[PDB]
Amino acid sequence: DSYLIRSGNNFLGILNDIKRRPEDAANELGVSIEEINSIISGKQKISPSLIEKAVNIWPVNERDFYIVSDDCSSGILIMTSQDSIKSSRIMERAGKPYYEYRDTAMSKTAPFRPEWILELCKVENNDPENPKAQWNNGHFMHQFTYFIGEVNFYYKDPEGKKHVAIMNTGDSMYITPFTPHTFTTRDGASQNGLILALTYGSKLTGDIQQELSSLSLDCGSQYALDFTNHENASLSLLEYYFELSNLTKEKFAKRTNFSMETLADFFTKKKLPTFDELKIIAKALNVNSRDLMPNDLTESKVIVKTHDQCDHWKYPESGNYEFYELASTTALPHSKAFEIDVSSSEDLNLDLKVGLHQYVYNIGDSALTINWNYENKTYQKSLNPGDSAYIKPFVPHNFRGNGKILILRIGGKISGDSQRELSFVGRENTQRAISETMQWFDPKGSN
Amino acid sequence: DSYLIRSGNNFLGILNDIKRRPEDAANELGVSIEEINSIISGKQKISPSLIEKAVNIWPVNERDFYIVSDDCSSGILIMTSQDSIKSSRIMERAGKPYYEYRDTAMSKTAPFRPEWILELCKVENNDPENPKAQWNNGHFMHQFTYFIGEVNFYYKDPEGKKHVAIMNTGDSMYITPFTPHTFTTRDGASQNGLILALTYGSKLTGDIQQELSSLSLDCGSQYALDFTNHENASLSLLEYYFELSNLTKEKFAKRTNFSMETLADFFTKKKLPTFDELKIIAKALNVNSRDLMPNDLTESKVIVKTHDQCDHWKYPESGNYEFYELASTTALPHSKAFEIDVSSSEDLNLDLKVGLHQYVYNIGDSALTINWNYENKTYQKSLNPGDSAYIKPFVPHNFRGNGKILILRIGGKISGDSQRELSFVGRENTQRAISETMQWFDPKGS
Ligand SMILES: [Fe+3]
Ligand SMILES: [Fe+3]
Ligand SMILES: [Fe+3]
Numbered sequence: 001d002s003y004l005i006r007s008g009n010n011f012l013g014i015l016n017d018i019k020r021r022p023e024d025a026a027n028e029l030g031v032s033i034e035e036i037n038s039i040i041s042g043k044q045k046i047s048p049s050l051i052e053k054a055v056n057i058w059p060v061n062e063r064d065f066y067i068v069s070d071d072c073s074s075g076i077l078i079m080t081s082q083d084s085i086k087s088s089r090i091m092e093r094a095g096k097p098y099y100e101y102r103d104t105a106m107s108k109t110a111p112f113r114p115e116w117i118l119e120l121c122k123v124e125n126n127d128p129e130n131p132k133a134q135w136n137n138g139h140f141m142h143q144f145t146y147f148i149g150e151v152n153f154y155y156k157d158p159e160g161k162k163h164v165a166i167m168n169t170g171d172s173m174y175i176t177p178f179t180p181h182t183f184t185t186r187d188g189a190s191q192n193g194l195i196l197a198l199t200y201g202s203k204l205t206g207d208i209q210q211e212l213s214s215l216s217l218d219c220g221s222q223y224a225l226d227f228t229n230h231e232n233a234s235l236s237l238l239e240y241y242f243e244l245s246n247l248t249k250e251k252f253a254k255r256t257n258f259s260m261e262t263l264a265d266f267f268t269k270k271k272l273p274t275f276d277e278l279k280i281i282a283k284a285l286n287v288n289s290r291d292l293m294p295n296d297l298t299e300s301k302v303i304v305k306t307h308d309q310c311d312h313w314k315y316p317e318s319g320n321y322e323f324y325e326l327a328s329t330t331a332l333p334h335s336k337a338f339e340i341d342v343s344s345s346e347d348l349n350l351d352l353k354v355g356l357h358q359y360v361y362n363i364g365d366s367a368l369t370i371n372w373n374y375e376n377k378t379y380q381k382s383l384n385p386g387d388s389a390y391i392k393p394f395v396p397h398n399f400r401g402n403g404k405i406l407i408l409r410i411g412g413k414i415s416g417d418s419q420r421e422l423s424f425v426g427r428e429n430t431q432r433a434i435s436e437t438m439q440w441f442d443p444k445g446s447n
Numbered sequence: 448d449s450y451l452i453r454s455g456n457n458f459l460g461i462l463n464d465i466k467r468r469p470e471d472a473a474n475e476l477g478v479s480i481e482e483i484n485s486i487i488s489g490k491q492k493i494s495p496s497l498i499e500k501a502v503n504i505w506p507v508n509e510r511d512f513y514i515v516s517d518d519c520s521s522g523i524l525i526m527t528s529q530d531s532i533k534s535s536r537i538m539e540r541a542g543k544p545y546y547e548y549r550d551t552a553m554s555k556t557a558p559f560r561p562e563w564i565l566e567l568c569k570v571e572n573n574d575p576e577n578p579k580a581q582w583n584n585g586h587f588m589h590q591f592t593y594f595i596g597e598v599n600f601y602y603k604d605p606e607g608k609k610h611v612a613i614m615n616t617g618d619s620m621y622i623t624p625f626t627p628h629t630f631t632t633r634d635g636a637s638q639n640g641l642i643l644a645l646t647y648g649s650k651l652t653g654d655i656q657q658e659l660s661s662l663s664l665d666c667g668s669q670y671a672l673d674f675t676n677h678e679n680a681s682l683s684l685l686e687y688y689f690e691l692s693n694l695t696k697e698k699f700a701k702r703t704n705f706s707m708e709t710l711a712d713f714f715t716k717k718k719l720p721t722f723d724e725l726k727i728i729a730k731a732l733n734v735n736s737r738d739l740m741p742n743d744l745t746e747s748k749v750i751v752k753t754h755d756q757c758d759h760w761k762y763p764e765s766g767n768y769e770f771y772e773l774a775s776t777t778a779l780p781h782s783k784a785f786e787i788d789v790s791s792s793e794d795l796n797l798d799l800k801v802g803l804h805q806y807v808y809n810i811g812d813s814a815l816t817i818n819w820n821y822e823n824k825t826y827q828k829s830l831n832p833g834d835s836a837y838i839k840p841f842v843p844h845n846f847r848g849n850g851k852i853l854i855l856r857i858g859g860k861i862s863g864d865s866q867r868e869l870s871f872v873g874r875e876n877t878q879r880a881i882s883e884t885m886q887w888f889d890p891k892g893s
Contacts (some may be wrong), residue, residue: 038828060553063510103465113464133893136887139887178880208860216839223866227871244802251760291780323693331868333688348882418650427668447578
């Protein structure tokens with residue numbers, strides 16, 4: 001029923017945005033005003049017949065009327081090791097069993113696609129060209145990976161040359177979307193190698209992808225700027241925002257009080273604008289220096305990090321956890337992967353809180369408890385070995401017991417531009433910004 | 448239909464992301480593998496029965512299966528002044544007709560909601576408290592406005608006080624979402640005032656709004672950082688990203704090699720980190736300095752800009768146009784509004800090209816010709832007074848003749864983070880990133 005309230009708020013917002021009153025919707029859609037008001041109030045779900053009428057007269061899409069179902073209303077969603085076994089499926093490559101996939105904790109509200117994947121193909125050497133390795137085409141999802149056992153991680157560099165990483169338990173990696181890769185188990189291993197492939201979408205799924213799909217490939221491909229290195233990224237961003245301004249080079253020079261030659265040094269990669277120069281350039285282009293800056297450095301398309309390279313620290317000061325910093329890339333500043341040693345059993349107090357989507361997997365051999373609070377209610381559930389969990393953003397929680405967990409945090413679609421826009425709109429408006437509850441004007445008047 | 452091909456590609460993407468082969472989808476959904484392949488190849492639209500079944504076993508929502516119909520297949524969509532009159536609706540406030548709305552050029556692929564709105568209520572003075580002004584509640588859409596005639600722009604400040612800006616032809620404004628406002632016509636004016644309220648969504652509509660809607664208000668509201676001023680924005684971002692790292696303050700100090708007095712001055716707003724210090728903080732928090740940076744300055748919630756205040760220049764160097772920079776705010780760096788005088792008769796070059804959504808309205812009293820190219824096909828169409836058009840991003844085009852146009856450019860959801868991510872993925876991967884066409888692996892091998 002809270003689904004219907006959110007669905008009614010969604011329909012009301014659609015009517016506000018196109019400047020249609022409830023009476024206007026009834027007249028233009030050929031339906032009674034009672035049906036329109038019953039949808040707005042959340043009494044009756046909107047029908048497929050009404051949705052199709054709306055697409056026919058208004059610049060709205062069918063997907064605008066279907067909201068996301070909340071499948072984790074208590075704030076944390078747990079999937080058992082037994083349920084993961086039931087979802088098992090074997091995939092063959094070149095006629096022999098190659099992978100076993102198992103689903104882990106996912107939610108309709110989060111972009112996680114975390115896969116338990118056992119490596120069924122064994123190799124006799126660590127040659128990256130070994131023909132036993134069956135390669136994929138690369139895939140759309142970003143992929144973080146945690147290694148368990150004697151796994152070989154095969155991947156290609158941008159030139160197409162094959163590489164392999166000889167991985168062991170606690171190693172981790174990140175691989176950029178559409179980079180081909182495959183995994184095997186080394187011969188002589190006590191058991192088959194296993195990877196926890198924590199794949200996810202970021203800022204190219206859902207609505208944004210649809211906004212691109214309606215563009216021609218020639219136009220759409222021009223959004224992809226040259227970020228192959230830091231200097232190219234600086235010029236690509238400068239050129240893009242210079243084009244956005246619709247200035248001439250002469251007016252641009254006159255506005256910044258830079259010479260035409262100074263500008264020429266920038267656009268030919270001869271000179272790089274200093275921080276002070278970048279701020280003047282940004283003001284002239286009606287943008288922020290933040291908008292002209294690339295990332296601080298250019299990461300490799302594939303990041304490999306062995307466990308011995310992981311920095312660690314106690315958290316919090318009391319020391320209930322030991323955090324291990326797993327593989328990462330500044331190309332995804334909101335993707336945080338941690339290995340956490342849990343050694344605390346004295347209380348139920350909530351010592352962890354973070355504004356990101358969270359996925360958990362019990363990689364130890366002991367059971368752990370998750371305590372959390374959500375909507376004025378406190379919960380406590382067990383996370384056994386092989387169990388996984390999804391945690392909504394900002395939910396205060398802890399982990400209790402003696403064990404080890406894998407955690408991946410991602411920003412989803414909110415972190416970054418969206419979070420910043422919501423902050424500018426104002427904290428007093430966040431509730432209405434998330435879900436509209438009133439018509440955009442009162443016809444009786446404000447007087 | 449290219450709709451069914453894109454819709455099948457979308458279904459393939461869903462299966463790839465959950466690691467389901469066509470055979471895996473057939474077994475779990477209880478349907479034949481021919482039905483699965485016929486959807487993927489575009490030979491048949493997926494049924495509501497199959498979608499409902501997919502939502503019941505997989506972490507997908509129904510909206511994931513409905514794609515956007517391309518209603519602008521030529522790259523530019525034109526709406527006539529007559530079509531705008533046909534969409535007319537007069538709205539009353541406090542018992543009297545107050546506005547006449549008319550729709551202008553819109554596309555299902557773009558976030559524009561641009562309204563032609565005639566001010567039917569006339570006021571006898573310029574008092575912001577005048578009871579004839581009928582205020583709204585504020586609305587979700589960002590709003591740019593271009594003024595035609597003797598219009599009064601009423602708005603409220605953050606403290607709820609009422610203001611009025613005495614506007615005239617060529618004036619423009621921006622107003623932040625949910626700021627209440629209304630418009631009237633000044634007396635003695637020869638005709639009713641008109642505004643072109645070019646409203647639009649940016650980065651809080653659709654999926655982003657859905658991602659927030661499933662969170663409790665307590666959790667969702669914590670995404671809203673304190674951006675009331677530049678210093679508060681700097682501390683808000685620093686604290687948010689410090690929490691993401693899950694460091695203690697002590698490990699943070701050891702990682703940065705900063706003294707505790709230096710960190711304490713940051714978190715109490717005594718001192719703000721220098722640019723060199725900000726790079727050290729970002730490396731320690733495993734993010735970019737740009738991610739820790741706020742905007743350069745804090746803009747007002749309402750921006751008012753008269754015609755006299757608009758800088759202008761000839762474009763290009765040869766001089767087919769005179770561009771006038773209308774109202775703007777660095778809170779939306781991808782929103783660019785221009786008034787353009789066109790005085791070019793015979794130049795073949797397509798001299799305008801920009802990676803943003805574009806809205807055009809003929810505000811002059813003369814017709815203009817728009818030339819453009821899209822998908823290896825050159826077009827030429829007329830833009831009469833009162834006609835409007837939507838232009839897809841990166842479409843090369845020009846305007847020819849003698850006249851005046853209003854242009855609003857917005858980034859939609861693409862500009863910013865999404866564009867940067869697509870750039871990192873690589874231009875050679877753009878086709879599959881936009882629409883996946885192959886299974887993520889070949890079951891026969893490499
Ligand atoms: Fe993969
Ligand atoms: Fe408005
Ligand atoms: Fe006057």
